[PDB]
Each structure stands twice: as C-alpha cells, then as structure tokens.
C-alpha cells in the first residue's frame, strides 16, 4: 500500500543508472607531455626534480606544460617512473606522451636523448626556465637556500629529499579541491605532524611560494586531480608491502578520505546515529526514506566513494547534503551543540530548516 | 467484493497500452542542416564554434537553421562531431543532413556554393549590425580570441556547452523567471573552476537561446536524448561529459513536479490524515500511477521535456484530495517549498487546511 | 602400442602451441603517418588519390612515409577513411598517427594541420612530389595521360576511379609476397577479367611503372601486408551485402586464398584425394601420419588460414611441404602427369625424391576397364 | 583416416564463411536521383515512359543520371511507384532520392519548383533531350513512329504498352552480364515467344538503338543490375498470384535462372546425372569429392543461388567451372557428343583437358 510509494522512490533512484554509454559521448582528447626520470642514477634524478619544481614555479609556462610538470613531480615515487604513470593513469580527456629523459645532461632543461625534431625545443625550455627564475625573483623550490643548490649524487639523500617534496604535494590535495582558501591552517597542521614524527627530512622543506603555485595548479586542473585520485585509490588498497614512500601517501590518505562528502557523513554521524527522541517525529519520515535510498546508492557507487568530491563525479550531486533538508537542519542543530570541535565548519546554506535548527539545538543541549 | 473494482481500475489503466502504431500516422519528415566538426585542429573547432554562436545570435536566421545551429553547439564536445549527432539522434519528425566544413576558416561562413557563402555573409553581417556589435561573450576579448591550441579549445568548448546546458533546466518548464536558477547553477561551476571564466556567455545571447529552446520541440528532443544518454553508463566521463552529467542532476524530474510533490509531501509524510475514508479513491489512483510510471520506463525523468502524452496521466492534478493536503503540509513545514504555485482549480480548501492543520 | 607413437607425434606438434605470450616479447613500435580522406567531397578525394599515387612514385621519400601512403591508397573504400584504418588495423610493429586530411587544397602535399611548426613539411612534400615527377621522366600515375590531369567533380566519377585504383592494389597482393618478380603474367590475367566483366572502369588504368613501384612497396614492407591481410580477412566475413567497391576486394580474394601455401594444398588435392592404389604402399605410412597431423594442425591455426604465407605467420614453416618429402614427391609425380595445368609449378627443391617421384609418374599413367585402356 | 582428408577439404571450403563484417567496411555512398510517377493515370505513365526512354537515349546525360532514369523506366510496373522502389531497393553502394513528379508538363525531363537555380537544371534537361534526338538522327523510342507520338489516356492501353517496354528490358538481363554482345539472337528468340503467346502489344515495339543503349547501361552499371535482380527475386517468390506485369517478368525468369553458372549446371546434368562408365575411373575420383563439397557449399550460400552471376556475388568465383576441371572436361565431352543443343556453348577455357574431354566423347 504505502510500501509501494517507498519502493517507487527507490525505483526512481536506481532507474537508468545501468547500461553502457555510446562512444559518441567521448570528449576531444588533449595531448599532454610527461617528461619522466629515465634511470636509477641520483645525479639525473635530483636535477630532474629541480627542473620539474621550476616548470611548476614558472609564471610564463602554459597549462599544457604545467600539468605535465606536475605529473613528473608526483611520479618521482616509482622505481620505473614512466611505467607507474602510464599504468595507473586512466582518464579519457587526456592522451599522454611519456618522454624518458636522457640523463638531463643538457643544462637547465631536460635534454632530448635522441635529439629534437626542432632544435628550439631545447630553447623554449631555456626560456621557460629563465622566466621561472626571473619571475620568482631568484626563489628556489626550498625555504632554506642550501637545499636549492644541493645537486645530489647519492640515493640516501635523494630519497630523503624526494619523500619530503612528494609529501608536501600530497598535503595540499586534501584541501586544494574543496576550499583552496582557508587552506593554509590545515595543511601546515598536517606538515608539522609528518616532520615531528620523522617521516620526512625537514632540511629539504619546500617554500610557501612553490606550495601556493602547486595548490593553484590542483584547484584549476581536473586532469591532474584525476591522476592523483587514481594513485590515492590504488595505494589505499592493502595486499602489498610499503616503503617510506607509499607510507607517506597512505598517511596523507587518512585526512583525504571522505573529504567533500561532508554533508552525507554529517547526517549519518549526527542526527541519524545520534538517534535523539526527536527522530520519532512524523515530519522526518520523508528525510529518513531519503537517507535509506542514499545509503543503498552510496554502496552502488562503489570503489570511487571515498573521493567523490575530489573527482567532481556526477553521482555526488545526489549525495549533496542539501538533498535532505529537514533531517540535515536538525543534524547540524545537534552536531554544533554537542561537539565543541564541530560548527567551525561554515554551514551558512539557505537549505537550513529553522524548526530542525532550533529543534536540533533544543534536543541536544536543553533536553537532558 | 472490493476486488473486482480494484482490478477494473487496473484494467482501464493498462487498456490500449499494447500494440504498435500503423506507419501511416508518421508526420512529414523535416530536413535540417547540421554543419558539423571537421577534425582535430583547434583552428577549425574555435572558428566553427564562433560561426554557430553567431547563427544563434542572428536576427535573420530561420527556425530550420537555428535548430541545426543548436545541434552544432551541443556536438562540439565530441572526438567526431558528425558521428555523435548521427548516432544519438533518434527522432521521428526530423531528417538530418550533416556536412562537416573543411576550410571553414575561409570567412565568416562555413567552407553554386558562391551564393551559399554570400548567404552566410549576409547572415553574419546582419547578426553584427542588428546586435549593435554586442559579442557572444560577457568579455568581448573572447569574441576575438582566435585560439590555436587544444587546451584553450577544450577550456572554451566546455564553457560554451555548459552555457547551453544551463538553459535546458528551465527551457520547457518555465522559460521566464529562469535567471535566478541558471545564475545559481553558473556560480557553482565557476567557483569549482570546472568552466573557464574568460568564456562566460552574455545575458542577451542566453535569453535569445532560452527562448529558442522553449519554442522549438524538435531541438529539445535531441538535447534531452543526449542528456539521458550521457547520464547513464559504466564509462569514464571527461571534464566535458562530467559537466553535462552534473547538470543532469538538476534536469531530472523537472516538469514531473506534481508526481514528485505528492510523493515527497503527503505520501512520504504519512500524516495521520492518511487514515481517513475519503482518501481511498486517491490511494487507488496513486497505485495505478506508480505501476504506470514503471511502464513508461527509460525516458521517465524527462517526460516533461519530451512533451510525452503519458505525462498527463502522471500529473498531480490526478489525485486531488491527497495533493491539496500534500501542498497544505509542504507549505507549512518546509521553508523553501510551497513557493511553487499550487493555485489550480483542483485545490480543495478543506483538505489544504487539513494539511496545514496536520 | 603403435597408436602411442602416432598420438605422440600429434602431442609434439601441439605442445607449446597453448598459453599466452609474455609482454616483454613486444617488438619496438614504429610511428607511421597516414594522411586520410577528411570529408565526403570528390574534389578532395581525387586530388588526394593523385597525391598518394605520387607519394608511392617518389624517389626521395622514406619507407615510413611510403607505407603510410599505401595505407591511404587502400583505405579510399571507406565512408570514413580514418575509421576504416583504426578499426581494421591490428598489427603490433606499427603505431599509426592518422592525420585527417584538412581539405589539403594547398597544392600537391597535405595542408599543415594547425599551421606547421616547420613549414618545411609542406616543402618536404613539394620535394617528394618534384623528385617523383622528375625521376619518373614525367610519367603520371594513369597510363593515358588525360586521366592524370583530370580533376573529379562528382561522386559517380570518383567511385569509378577509386574502384579502378583499388583494384590495381588488390591485383598485386596475389603475387607481392609469394613471387615478387615474374608477377606480370598473373596480374595482367586478373586485370583482363575485371575489365572484360566491365566491373572496373578502364579510363582509370594505372601505369606499369606505378604498379611495379607499388608491387615492390608490398614486397619490401611487412607492415603494409599485415594491414592488407587484416582487411582481406575482415571483408571476407559474411552477414552483409557487398556493392561494387567491397565486391572487387572480395572477388580478388577468391584468387588470393591459400596463396603461398601451394605445396600443402597440392599434396591434399593431388596424391591424397586422388587415392591411387599405390597409396597403400607400406613406406608411405609415416607420411600419411604426417599429413594427418598437418591437417589437424591447419584446423587449429584457424581464421588466418587463407593467408598464412602472406602474413609471414610462424606456424607456416611447419605447414611447408618438405615436411612430408616422400608423400610430397609422390604427390608431385602424379600431379605433373595427370593435370595439364600443373607442372608450371617450380619443383626444383631438395625435398623432392627423384626415385619416388618417378614412382608417382609411373603410378599415374599406367566392369569393362576398356574405356581406361582406350583413353 | 582418408575420410579425415575429404572432411578437411570440406572444412577449408566453409571455413571463415561465418561471422558478420565490421561496419567501417561500408563503401562511400552514391546519391542517385529517381524521378517517379506521382499519380495513377495512363496519361502520366505513357508520357513519362517516353521521357525515360529518351533520358536513356540521350548522349548528354551523365551516368549517374542515366542509371536513375533506367530505374524510373523499370519501376513503371508498380501500383505505387515510390513504394515499389523504396521497398525492393536493397543495395548499399547507392542512396536513392525519390522525386515524385506533379504531372510534369516540362518536356523530356521533370518540372522543377525548387527555384531559380533549378531553371538551369531544366535547360540542362532540354539540352539532354535535344542532344538525344539529334545524336540518334530522329529515331524515337519505338521502331514505328506512331508509337513515339501515342499519348495514351486509359489503363488497358497503358498496361499493354508498359508491359511491352518492360518485357523489352527483361529480355536483356538474360545476356547483359553473361555475353553483352552476341545478345540479339537470344533476345529476339524470347521476343518471338511473348508475341506468339499474345502477352506483349507489338504496336509499342522498341527500337534496336534504344534496346542496345539500355543493354549497354545494364552491362556497365552494377547498381542498376542490383535493383533489377532485387525485383526479379521479389516477384519470383510466392504468397500471391501474378497478373500481366509480374507474369511477364516471371516468364522471362525461366531463361534467366542459373545464368552465368553454365559450368556448374552442365557438370550436374551431363556426366554426373548420366552415370557414364566413366564414373568408374579412379583418377577422376577426387573430382567427385570436389563436386560434393561444391553442392554442400551451394546449399549454404542459399537464397541468391539462381542469380549469383547477375549479382556479381564473390562466392560465385569459387563456384566457377574450372575449379573442378577434370570432371568438367569429361562432362563437356559427354554433353557435346550426346546433346544436339549443347556444344553451341563456347567452352574454350584453359581449364579443358583434351585427354579427359576425348574420354568423355569416347565414352
């Protein structure tokens, strides 16, 4: 009877989710160049890292170069850096050329191992590097200047440094694509942890200027975030040994998961699991039926679920906490009253339901 | 006892659902010209987009040209623009002719044909002149840009396409009063850095296109067909397809208002008033409706946009007692709701107050 | 007992056929540029065919360009030339870049894709075309010169011409990789058929000099032959009507089947199927067991079978006659004696056993039975 | 043992016949214009036949227009012109645009209401018609001039005339694709039959010049032959009686079936069905295994079988005569010796083996 209606709401939520899209939907593929560390020699690897840091730091380089730079920077983990990128990178909008560097013996820029079709390739690179230095007023990637000059020759120092730079990229991801302003407090708090706990070597610390340039790159590029979230999912899975490298990633992961699914979690944690007497009220029924459909839906979205927000994924709109307003308004009213740490999240949405906001507060705070 | 009556209501609802319509009913198939993407050069792609923007901006273009323009505009995404149109277009009134312009950079128009190029010239001149020089973009630099590389191209194409898809959301439910909603959706995409702001498109152009969407069914049919097709499917979608899919979540259920309002408010609300004897006929109605909704199947979230006849049956006016109470509850409890006008002849004041009073 | 041995021979033959090969075996992929028909306009299509004929005729152009040209030339069939290449082409040595022709009304070569980084490419093309003209002493692709000049204005003329050029590609495949010299006799014999049958339009006849230059391109490039054989298999499959274009391909196919497996089929047709009383002679037993293993092997190799030799397919070595000497020599001695058309096959091979072949001959030319005596 | 070999030969012959070819192989589609009778009057039908005869007779029309003209001319059979073309026409290389004329008073070609640029088109048509008349030295469609002027008004005379012209098309198909010259003897022999049987109305006899121009159009166009053979198959099928129009087609069909598969039928009829002492010969044994594989193959090719040659069907090549030469050379030796009608067939192929052919005669 009434059961038909509830089942129908569920039917609508699942309807047409299935099937396989026609290939005509394929968006025009962008050719992106990834310069990638050729061998396990520390001389090449340090210099290539410096090159890549500077590509990203350059004010005059185009977006196409900058994304490729960012891909070099966050592939430095790998024993076979080119293979790591090519094999995990799985996003249709971008078609990769991976270029394995010739020991970077050319000079400031990466040096074409087999020789350029155009000899200016080397110079466009030179202009890019010069403009990078000049526009940044001489500021090298590191905060403390000896590090900018380092020119490393040994594996131990290399890994100390690489782990350190990588960790400083991955600190950013957590906020770069949810609120890239307000970001600094959180990302410094996470940095302090990794350094204090001796996971990464602070002698190699990367400058606010480099970090802001990378944070902005993350905010403004989907294609970068696609590769990042691919890796973030891959290393979240168990069934493998990890070195210091994968360990830092996994550590960052514990901040990164669930991020930008705030509302879905907040109604589950506060209000639903809170089970305040007010949950029995007739008005809530529609909201409860909503959440049920949401939980089953969340299951169906599957492996990408811990990173929906970062992926910009379509499904996430349905999850948007704005979807279940009565329950949500009450869920904030409880949450903000009961947890002193909560409520520092800005919840000024027009979707707040006054009755539930006053009633959630009145349940949690002045009802025992 | 009761059982006969209930079964009879079901009989009526399913009577004549079956069978396949005789081909003689088919309306005279209308030829539409869709100038389509030529290939993998940003030079052609930018210029073709500017051509299409200007076709829609022109005061002198006929309906037949304008539909074809709209199809060019919402094919710009694809690796093979012509293939995308031909393969998804599945529409019983219209026959597409599609000619991908090669040397589209010859002038303003795409590349006996000498007359055609001058027709195009007239179209473009009249467009400029009649618009008093106002360009498609909110920043005029965009109109002159002459883009040379894939990255800028995709940034721009995604941006223009998103500006088409902003419209669809209101085009065929309320094509005026649209501004507030379409700006609200725009704010999101820009703040999230999904669409590249240099390419924001001008209110003048957007109004002209909104009106074109409202007044032309055949275009909206193609749009909604694509909007459904790219919404489903176990495939990765690029920034491009992702923005479409995202917009979809606002587009779905739109212009099925009534069916949803009675489900959300009153039905799922389960107000004590639901026990009352009077409701029985309405409940039997809703049952028939739910089973009917199932039967209408794949296009369901967009029956309104498709002008689908079945839509009438699903309209909330069908179960008037429950609906009047459904508004009475909704408007009382849920702050943002009930701003949608429930002033129909079907409103029963006693039941509307009973809804309020519950 | 004896049965174990026969089963063991079969086991050896199929041992190691199984499994999936480790990816490390993937050979270094060659980047090849294919210019392909951009749009459905006969103006572009005629001119681009002339360009492509000349790319293959050019004395100064690299093999990498020449293969890609040949792929343009034999993708003229398709409504969407790029799609035809991408969808049929499945050969690992070559990685294709499809430059979709941008009208290319710019001259002899392609038009520069987005404005060239180096316009030397259009000038490279110009050099290629000049060198082609000059080195060929002014002979244009078509044999009667008006055709070489003629700009094509309608689809009718286009298809007439394209069918004509394509047929000239497909007449080559029959000998390109099986007898790359001495080819003329066969290729002319097949030309006569298509013309006499009025299937392809002789106004567009292509010059012996261009045909030999394309025959040689086929001989010397594996990558080309791979694509040819891929298309030849694909269009051979049924579940579709074929009109004139695909029909010419398919028609050529019926000559092209089994080619360069001559000896294998010949033992089956002549000797084996012939079942002369002499087949019961005890010496042959091991040979018969051989042929059986071969036939079951052939079955196992499956879809590529009609073109194994042309595809350079490894298994082909095992299939080669010489794998069954005694049976083969007997098979020839009979064949040459009984069939007037045979014997034009070159049998100067070591695997031939004179004594046994003289037995094949001697067998072949040796309830009334009166009729047999009279004839 | 030996049985495996025979089974294997059969396997090879059928291998890879299966499956459905990838759609990208679809060859570049040609647009062809068919002008078609708009309405059901003998007035229009007579005049349009005159128009169409002249379109085909014209030296000035391009091949693409000439094929489309021929399709107009041999769609005159149908109760509903447009429907007849659209429903039978099933050959992928050609994409038809049908134009239904509004009682064209224009002249030889159609009237055009598309506009100002079409005024040139009508003058192109005028040039085509003039050049047709002039180049043919005044010879109109019919052999006897009254027919050229006729302008018939009524159904009975219309069908009498149309069936007469159409029968003159269908007499051609018999040799168009199998001996396009030397055709006259056979096509006259079939003419004699239809006239003596009173099926076709001799006042409307069509001129040698027009018949040769149509014969040549059939020989040199695949696309036309495809439509002809599509109709020829469609009217051959049962589930209905056929009156005069389809009946003439079907009558001609009895000459048209098996055409250009001469070799195959001849081996079956002569030699094989005849069970000569020669069946005994061991040397010709393989040949037998060949024929068996062929017969099973023939079965598998199915519906198009009696017209493979006319359709240019590739699988036809396999079916070819000198594919099974020893048996064929002996089958010819028997056939030429025993049957007075045979032997007038040209059997001068390189496939013929004199020893085996003499054995066939000697038998």
PDB file of N, CA and C in Angstrom, chain C residues 292-319:
ATOM      1  N   UNK C 292      48.084 -36.263 -41.712  1.00  0.00           N
ATOM      2  CA  UNK C 292      47.002 -36.216 -40.731  1.00  0.00           C
ATOM      3  C   UNK C 292      47.306 -35.149 -39.683  1.00  0.00           C
ATOM      4  N   UNK C 293      48.508 -35.180 -39.093  1.00  0.00           N
ATOM      5  CA  UNK C 293      48.940 -34.219 -38.085  1.00  0.00           C
ATOM      6  C   UNK C 293      48.888 -32.792 -38.632  1.00  0.00           C
ATOM      7  N   UNK C 294      49.264 -32.630 -39.925  1.00  0.00           N
ATOM      8  CA  UNK C 294      49.244 -31.341 -40.618  1.00  0.00           C
ATOM      9  C   UNK C 294      47.813 -30.803 -40.746  1.00  0.00           C
ATOM     10  N   UNK C 295      46.884 -31.669 -41.175  1.00  0.00           N
ATOM     11  CA  UNK C 295      45.502 -31.269 -41.402  1.00  0.00           C
ATOM     12  C   UNK C 295      44.874 -30.807 -40.082  1.00  0.00           C
ATOM     13  N   UNK C 296      45.050 -31.585 -38.996  1.00  0.00           N
ATOM     14  CA  UNK C 296      44.551 -31.232 -37.665  1.00  0.00           C
ATOM     15  C   UNK C 296      45.224 -29.954 -37.187  1.00  0.00           C
ATOM     16  N   UNK C 297      46.521 -29.790 -37.510  1.00  0.00           N
ATOM     17  CA  UNK C 297      47.248 -28.566 -37.169  1.00  0.00           C
ATOM     18  C   UNK C 297      46.621 -27.344 -37.859  1.00  0.00           C
ATOM     19  N   UNK C 298      46.345 -27.492 -39.167  1.00  0.00           N
ATOM     20  CA  UNK C 298      45.776 -26.449 -40.019  1.00  0.00           C
ATOM     21  C   UNK C 298      44.469 -25.927 -39.433  1.00  0.00           C
ATOM     22  N   UNK C 299      43.622 -26.875 -39.013  1.00  0.00           N
ATOM     23  CA  UNK C 299      42.373 -26.618 -38.323  1.00  0.00           C
ATOM     24  C   UNK C 299      42.612 -25.727 -37.100  1.00  0.00           C
ATOM     25  N   UNK C 300      43.640 -26.086 -36.309  1.00  0.00           N
ATOM     26  CA  UNK C 300      43.954 -25.425 -35.049  1.00  0.00           C
ATOM     27  C   UNK C 300      44.428 -23.988 -35.278  1.00  0.00           C
ATOM     28  N   UNK C 301      45.125 -23.732 -36.403  1.00  0.00           N
ATOM     29  CA  UNK C 301      45.593 -22.371 -36.700  1.00  0.00           C
ATOM     30  C   UNK C 301      44.434 -21.432 -37.024  1.00  0.00           C
ATOM     31  N   UNK C 302      43.356 -21.962 -37.658  1.00  0.00           N
ATOM     32  CA  UNK C 302      42.058 -21.290 -37.639  1.00  0.00           C
ATOM     33  C   UNK C 302      41.927 -20.084 -38.583  1.00  0.00           C
ATOM     34  N   UNK C 303      41.362 -18.935 -38.132  1.00  0.00           N
ATOM     35  CA  UNK C 303      40.929 -17.844 -39.016  1.00  0.00           C
ATOM     36  C   UNK C 303      41.927 -17.254 -40.008  1.00  0.00           C
ATOM     37  N   UNK C 304      43.216 -17.246 -39.662  1.00  0.00           N
ATOM     38  CA  UNK C 304      44.238 -16.668 -40.524  1.00  0.00           C
ATOM     39  C   UNK C 304      44.587 -17.597 -41.699  1.00  0.00           C
ATOM     40  N   UNK C 305      44.112 -18.866 -41.702  1.00  0.00           N
ATOM     41  CA  UNK C 305      44.483 -19.951 -42.615  1.00  0.00           C
ATOM     42  C   UNK C 305      44.574 -19.589 -44.087  1.00  0.00           C
ATOM     43  N   UNK C 306      43.568 -18.891 -44.675  1.00  0.00           N
ATOM     44  CA  UNK C 306      43.572 -18.491 -46.092  1.00  0.00           C
ATOM     45  C   UNK C 306      44.747 -17.614 -46.527  1.00  0.00           C
ATOM     46  N   UNK C 307      45.479 -17.050 -45.560  1.00  0.00           N
ATOM     47  CA  UNK C 307      46.535 -16.121 -45.940  1.00  0.00           C
ATOM     48  C   UNK C 307      47.842 -16.322 -45.150  1.00  0.00           C
ATOM     49  N   UNK C 308      48.198 -17.540 -44.713  1.00  0.00           N
ATOM     50  CA  UNK C 308      49.244 -17.731 -43.704  1.00  0.00           C
ATOM     51  C   UNK C 308      50.612 -17.212 -44.169  1.00  0.00           C
ATOM     52  N   UNK C 309      50.912 -17.557 -45.424  1.00  0.00           N
ATOM     53  CA  UNK C 309      52.201 -17.266 -46.038  1.00  0.00           C
ATOM     54  C   UNK C 309      52.362 -15.755 -46.196  1.00  0.00           C
ATOM     55  N   UNK C 310      51.297 -15.093 -46.668  1.00  0.00           N
ATOM     56  CA  UNK C 310      51.331 -13.656 -46.912  1.00  0.00           C
ATOM     57  C   UNK C 310      51.488 -12.915 -45.584  1.00  0.00           C
ATOM     58  N   UNK C 311      50.940 -13.488 -44.487  1.00  0.00           N
ATOM     59  CA  UNK C 311      51.013 -12.890 -43.151  1.00  0.00           C
ATOM     60  C   UNK C 311      52.351 -13.217 -42.470  1.00  0.00           C
ATOM     61  N   UNK C 312      53.275 -13.924 -43.163  1.00  0.00           N
ATOM     62  CA  UNK C 312      54.561 -14.336 -42.576  1.00  0.00           C
ATOM     63  C   UNK C 312      54.333 -15.159 -41.310  1.00  0.00           C
ATOM     64  N   UNK C 313      53.155 -15.802 -41.183  1.00  0.00           N
ATOM     65  CA  UNK C 313      52.773 -16.442 -39.914  1.00  0.00           C
ATOM     66  C   UNK C 313      53.703 -17.593 -39.558  1.00  0.00           C
ATOM     67  N   UNK C 314      54.266 -17.627 -38.337  1.00  0.00           N
ATOM     68  CA  UNK C 314      55.353 -18.534 -37.962  1.00  0.00           C
ATOM     69  C   UNK C 314      55.088 -20.021 -38.215  1.00  0.00           C
ATOM     70  N   UNK C 315      53.845 -20.387 -37.866  1.00  0.00           N
ATOM     71  CA  UNK C 315      53.369 -21.763 -37.943  1.00  0.00           C
ATOM     72  C   UNK C 315      53.604 -22.288 -39.362  1.00  0.00           C
ATOM     73  N   UNK C 316      53.648 -21.366 -40.347  1.00  0.00           N
ATOM     74  CA  UNK C 316      53.661 -21.682 -41.784  1.00  0.00           C
ATOM     75  C   UNK C 316      54.813 -22.614 -42.085  1.00  0.00           C
ATOM     76  N   UNK C 317      55.939 -22.437 -41.364  1.00  0.00           N
ATOM     77  CA  UNK C 317      57.129 -23.247 -41.628  1.00  0.00           C
ATOM     78  C   UNK C 317      56.776 -24.738 -41.515  1.00  0.00           C
ATOM     79  N   UNK C 318      56.017 -25.042 -40.445  1.00  0.00           N
ATOM     80  CA  UNK C 318      55.679 -26.431 -40.137  1.00  0.00           C
ATOM     81  C   UNK C 318      54.815 -26.992 -41.263  1.00  0.00           C
ATOM     82  N   UNK C 319      53.907 -26.143 -41.792  1.00  0.00           N
ATOM     83  CA  UNK C 319      52.930 -26.490 -42.812  1.00  0.00           C
ATOM     84  C   UNK C 319      53.680 -26.762 -44.110  1.00  0.00           C
TER      85      UNK C 319
END
